[PDB]
Design a protein around this ligand. Structure first.
Ligand code: NA
Lengths: 157, 146
């Protein structure tokens, strides 16, 4: 994970803050990796940060007992049907991830880069890109959604 | 949500985001005993270093822990001082509202908060003191006037 904070949670929080999202949303973005990558749980988040943040976090957390294809399909459905905040949490997370991917590829064959393989990564990112605007009014789509779309088009053309 | 209020305090005062995040994470880190390695791998070295500056040794008595915090706010850098004071400001903000509409007792809370207030400015130039340090001093004075 690259600039400016050299930390995925800090960079995702910045994308959300700059897009105008309230503090509860920014913090939910910050805590995503804490829940998925450490022993911290949903109950720990509720006890310390409250139910609103805990619920925002839970909206994008993967159930790790499911296969990659199933976890990913569930995220696509959530980016389609969630509210603006829920959609933003998912897109911001993917945007920082693809930013690091573009950086790696700019030095590294896209057909050999992904451990889950190109086809699956393409299917996934195109799925987020093609569903993130569903049900949103043009005036509320965050500018960073366009940055993610451009990255998907660049990496998976 | 107290952590969010601590974040708001630090951000408004102009501190960099690593300090803001370290403030936000203080309770979570103590309530779950998250290791340095976990904080460091998840949030980065800058956040991890700041979080480590304000973590109490649970084996010592409450008074020993607090006395140590009082000495830390005296000798720490500006960011370390700010983390401690923001935490206490948030706490007292709640107490003041409840009192208008104490853990371990009044005498101990008074001793602790007066200690922070009386040592937070040590080693700083008047122009460096965040205005929220003054908000905190006023709360200590109003709450512990008896
Ligand atoms: Na977890």
């Amino acid at each position: 994970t690259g600039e400016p904070y050299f930390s995925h949670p800090l960079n995702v929080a910045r994308i959300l803050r700059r897009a105008g999202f309230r503090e509860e949303v920014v913090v939910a973005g910050l805590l995503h990796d804490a829940v998925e990558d450490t022993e911290m749980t949903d109950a720990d988040i509720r006890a310390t940060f409250g139910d609103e943040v805990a619920d925002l976090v839970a909206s994008h957390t993967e159930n790790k007992t499911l296969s990659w294809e199933e976890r990913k399909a569930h995220t696509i459905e959530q980016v389609r049907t969630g509210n603006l905040e829920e959609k933003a949490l998912i897109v911001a997370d993917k945007l920082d991830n693809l930013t690091s991917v573009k950086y790696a590829l700019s030095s590294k064959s896209v057909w050999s880069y992904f451990k889950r393989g190109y086809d699956l990564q393409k299917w996934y990112n195109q799925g987020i890109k093609n569903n993130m605007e569903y049900g949103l009014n043009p005036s509320e789509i965050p500018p960073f959604f366009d940055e993610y779309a451009r990255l998907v088009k660049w990496i998976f053309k």
